[PDB]
Amino acid sequence: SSVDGASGAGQLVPEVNASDPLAMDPVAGSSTAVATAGQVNPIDPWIINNFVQAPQGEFTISPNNTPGDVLFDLSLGPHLNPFLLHLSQMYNGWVGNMRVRIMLAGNAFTAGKIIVSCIPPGFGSHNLTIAQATLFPHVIADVRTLDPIEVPLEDVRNVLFHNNDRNQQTMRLVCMLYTPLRTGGGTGDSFVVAGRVMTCPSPDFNFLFLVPPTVEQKTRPFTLPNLPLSSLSNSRAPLPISSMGISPDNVQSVQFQNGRCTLDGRLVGTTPVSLSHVAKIRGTSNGTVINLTELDGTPFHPFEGPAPIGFPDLGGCDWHINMTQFGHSSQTQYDVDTTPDTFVPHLGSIQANGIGSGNYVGVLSWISPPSHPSGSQVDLWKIPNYGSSITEATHLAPSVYPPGFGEVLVFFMSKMPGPGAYNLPCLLPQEYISHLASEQAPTVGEAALLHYVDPDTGRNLGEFKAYPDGFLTCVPNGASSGPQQLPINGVFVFVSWVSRFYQLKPVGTAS
Amino acid sequence: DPLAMDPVAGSSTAVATAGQVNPIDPWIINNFVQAPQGEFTISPNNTPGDVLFDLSLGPHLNPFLLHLSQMYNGWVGNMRVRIMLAGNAFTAGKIIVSCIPPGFGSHNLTIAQATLFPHVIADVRTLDPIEVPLEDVRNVLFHNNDRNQQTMRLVCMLYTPLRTGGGTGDSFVVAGRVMTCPSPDFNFLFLVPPTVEQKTRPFTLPNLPLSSLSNSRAPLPISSMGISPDNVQSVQFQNGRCTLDGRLVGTTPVSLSHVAKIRGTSNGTVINLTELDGTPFHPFEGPAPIGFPDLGGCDWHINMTQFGHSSQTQYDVDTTPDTFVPHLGSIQANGIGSGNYVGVLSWISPPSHPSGSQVDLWKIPNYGSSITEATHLAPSVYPPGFGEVLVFFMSKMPGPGAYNLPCLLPQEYISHLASEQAPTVGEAALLHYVDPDTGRNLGEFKAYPDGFLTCVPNGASSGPQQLPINGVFVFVSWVSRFYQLKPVGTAS
Amino acid sequence: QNGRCTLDGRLVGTTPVSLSHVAKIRGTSNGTVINLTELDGTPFHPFEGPAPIGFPDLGGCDWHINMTQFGHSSQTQYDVDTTPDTFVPHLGSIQANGIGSGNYVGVLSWISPPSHPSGSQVDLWKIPNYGSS
Amino acid sequence: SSVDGASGAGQLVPEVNASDPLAMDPVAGSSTAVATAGQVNPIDPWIINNFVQAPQGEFTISPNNTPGDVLFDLSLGPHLNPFLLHLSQMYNGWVGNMRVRIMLAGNAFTAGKIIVSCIPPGFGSHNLTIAQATLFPHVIADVRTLDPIEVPLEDVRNVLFHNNDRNQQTMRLVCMLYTPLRTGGGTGDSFVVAGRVMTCPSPDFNFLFLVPPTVEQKTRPFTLPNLPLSSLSNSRAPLPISSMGISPDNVQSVQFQNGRCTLDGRLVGTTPVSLSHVAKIRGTSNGTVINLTELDGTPFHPFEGPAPIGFPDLGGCDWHINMTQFGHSSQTQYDVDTTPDTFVPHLGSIQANGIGSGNYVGVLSWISPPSHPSGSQVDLWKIPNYGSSITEATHLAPSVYPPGFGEVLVFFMSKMPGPGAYNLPCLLPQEYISHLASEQAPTVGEAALLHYVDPDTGRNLGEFKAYPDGFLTCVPNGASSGPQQLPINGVFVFVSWVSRFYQLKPVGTAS
């Protein structure tokens, strides 16, 4: 299976890693649980020795990385091996050790070292300095080493075995950059070292109790709906996606309230589940002020959020919705300016520039440049002013920004009907949101590496990173280049969980 | 580390129930031969996950075996595969080969997923050839020549990006070569009269230069290769339509002798069509008489003749009138005496009825919209593939201007395909447009089963138009879904 | 002269490969004499053969083609007698019994009994006279 | 003798070539002929083991080469070894095997592989694809391999032995590029791999019958006259050489009719043997039209060629020759325009713009810019219009063009007397032609590698390629540079036979 280039690698790089043994005693496997577990479930012997790419199987070192940066943080569990992960969904509990193999093999021109340290359960989370890492049983390796480093992840236990809950704390394997990475030679800065992590269970490892296959959440794999982008819709308005886009050089952080969902499936802001609630409002007109309620007719509440669920979040826009009513044959237009002191969505009170009394259901369908400021340009990156009710907790959705090395926020855009060429940007397609909500799959790792692919040929079109808070990022090639240059036939495919600093390959074509 | 597979038996299983067990020439037995799809290159531009090659266990991988398969009706055995890479000690990057069992599917994978199969990951710097056993995982005792037989597959993908050091010449790429050879387990099964079985017949294209051939829509010499304008995407001709199996579609005939011709009885008002043999046409058998011209946006007109009567009469036709019901064998006789003639399209003009506007030969004329009958038209063809474009064979036709007539397949090709009804194995046929004299490859094309070619144009102006018409199309091998063509044309 | 081919696969006489070159001629009409060329617009040569490749070989026949031209919407019947001394196919020079000047492409489509012998019967077994050079 | 840099080559390149044996049985040597040959002639034991550079001893790989390109094509015979070749001229027949050694050793930075395949006699000539080559017993090697690859060229025979005729078909060794050549590092594109081929006979090899030493043509070595360029003359006119030159960027193909000879010694066009026939005409003046004949007085014939042997071939020129006559004290001038319909050299008929009746002998000696076109410039690269007699086979000499990688045609030029600075270009010097004709030496290989050298110091001044059809080519350094910058004291020396694609080193100095 493994064929290191030893034969033709000359002798520019070290084959095997010479290192002192782990300052740690061996730990027992199943022998412990045998007497108290209800069952001791054996696993397929074929899995027992195959070193397979872990779900957290990739990482990257680059000269941008600084010593101390965490390349990957592995916590002992079935979730470290794809096969085990699948079997996890069927059992309740486990005990055993894992065999980890990190792979490196940079050019004979690269220099640098990493450090892997085992952290005992019960230590807790603390930001470790490279020097601190030394205090734990560790191993150090040169990035050029041909043969993969093998490190045993011992199952240090206080109890007989483990269950599939959050009350469990297992041992960790933290890998950080030890010394800065620096390529010599004709330095192609596009050069970063691509690492791989593979694992296989030690024969001590065993699953414990047979249980209904899917029920537990801890075992659920992160999945994305297999649907071409074009077929999906926007989250800030009921419009179909047209293309992907990037925020102008000026715009950096964003605070959209609709179309926000955590990768675990947690809805944030005013984000609803279905499009049937997107960019709409319901309330009773007083001929002067409209008293808002949820679309269900249920009463809105200032402690609930910034505004009623589904309440449109277009900022630098002077939007006007189409309002309809039940039992009354009519269709009117409601022009709204987000500037006036009468615009207090947070208190279920807004203006009524020309609407009779009653109760309506309006759908945003026509926007225009903001009137009140100075009769100026449209800025859809902005969010409207939700009544600053000092007497009520304005629970807003936080702002997002790209945390990676030269990464930028990626938006899904659809053209919006108005007095010009407008296109509404959102963070995630509505359907994606709907999916995540259903499958509340726990997010393992700081980010999810995705590969945008053409379903027909299976050609990798782009590389993106999805962050926990619910948003994608990418590295645009040239200033002119970016995801806008990509077709909307593709689908996003989850590749592996990665660290905050996994460096992506620039997207698009620069010329 | 080893391969996650138990070895599979060879002929052992066959002996008991096959009629014979035929041995192979020992010289072939362990001689490594390059496979048809045996070439690939890894440029720094490839990303981990890109597919380098795809293989299916079968006699077709080895030309010797292939030639032999046409003499026996079965086989079982294991091949040996060798991948060889060409790299310096100054490179880096790994490749991964996964063994995919038959009965899986052609869905695309992640490099992570590729690991889940018994696999081999090699570092680019390796000097020695990488040997991987292609095992005959079987559900049955042995294989009978079928397309139903699914075999062991080998998929190769880039595992880690190619990173070359030194004064990095981005022109630098790691080339790869694939070779196979049967192992002593392999054996052919029953001796059958050579080339009689259809299932074994190899795909073949006539060994003739494009220039000497003709169009399948009108009896005109092919003068150039062209592409449909950015505006024209889907096409749907009715003549010059033929599957690689050798099945004639639409009104497509075999010989040029039936191309762009019609025969029928003139009522002095309406012309009642029939097949060229004087046989009755039938709205159910097809959308129009076999050989009936399919030139769309054109105000074309033939030169009719008759037997036993010394005469030549120009018959003008507009494809717009409600009297134009080709599907019912009834058309207009705009100024024709009664009788029964034989017309041949010889002069075209821009369509009169739309507004006296321009000609569009990419279009197809209207074949009498009969609801009662089954106007079984030949389906529209569009280019299937990421950036693949439809290739056409054009000939200049006489009229008031420049009339380059598009075509899908030279008639001669059609005549050939029908004769040798070769089964289509795989998704597309990789072809090479070679210059006969130099034996040099001028372009890489794809032939799809339905009967048409495709290619990847280099620049917006660059493409097949920039190629000489002295080349011959040579069949290389049956390619996979993942095969990406090499851009054709001279870009600079 | 057409439809002549050895089993080795060697084309003999004016025999072409495709029907697309059968019973056809292309040349420049001098309004008196027609100066022939190969269908590609390439020059014919008395030494390479007895006549242009694809040039009809119907003998005892007073045949005549239907000529066309590119960039000109036209169809003109060109009548031919294989007896006249002006009929020198071998030298790419023939009669233009009533044809305007230009360069056309003719296809044999209608035959009649030979006029010059005595207005007698047709003999398709014969071969026409290719200018005795 | 052989000292591979193993000691200091580090371990960046492979020493020995690891390859599976040749799928082929050993073949017998002399043992066969012993009983029926009249004699079995032994050869000097010193030749038996010396690996010497074969006459087809050089080849070059460059990134311009594409897989499939033939680097060299060797056919079994004495002509593969310089010593044997010389002995060949003395014997009639042979039998035996050869030992071939191809040498490579590119930088540790180059990557690439070649393939050598043995092709059985009786297969014939076919353009093989790299994949086809695999079907024959073959060997593959990496261009970096230090130690020379040794391949036995087996004498597969249908008969007992061989004779020195063309009825013989021996085994071949075709070497093609297997994978594209690509240099890494600080890529100096001037970098191409210089290969060498050396051979020595296997002790099985033996010559057969003693025969008069030179008589047979098959054995004759290609030779060039050892004379400094300056001493030679032009082929299109009786003028001494002045300097070498290149066709202007615009001119590519040429069709000169005089000064054309195949390397085997075959005269083409109107090319005569001696200068005494160059640029001359003879015929009888009719006061209006001159009826041409050969200089011998013999009658010219339209089936013979384009014009009488020696008939001047200057195209874009309005030339006028000096005409003399026998028995009549006179010297007149004959001004000729190559445009008129009266100018039918192919039919032995030309004008007589002012010449009385009789028979003359004219020598081109004065040229002027073409009158009839538009009174425009002189283009000596052109060839005049030879009467397009449709009733006669205009057997013209084909056109020539450089087939190599960035190669251009090399011309020999002499200054011609006229109204300005004119210089007549030709393909080969007349004397060279005279030589080739005498020594009809068979041409082995697609081209002959020549080295222009200063006879006094023996310094290599330039590298050129002579093609079978009779013309040289070279790679000019800069646009300003070329062979015009070289002295005319040099002599051309045959180095080795090479493939069509042998890449030459640019000539001259660019600045």
Swiss-Prot record, chains A, D:
Cellular component per GO, a single term: host cell cytoplasm
Name under which the protein is recorded: Capsid protein VP1
Disulfide bonds: none
Site (Cleavage): K218, T219
Region listing for P2 sub-domain, in residue ranges: 270-396
CDD domains, per database record: rhv_like (cd00205)
Region listing for Protruding domain, in residue ranges: 217-511
Region (Shell domain): 1-216
Keyword entries, A-Z: Capsid protein, Host cytoplasm, T=3 icosahedral capsid protein, Virion
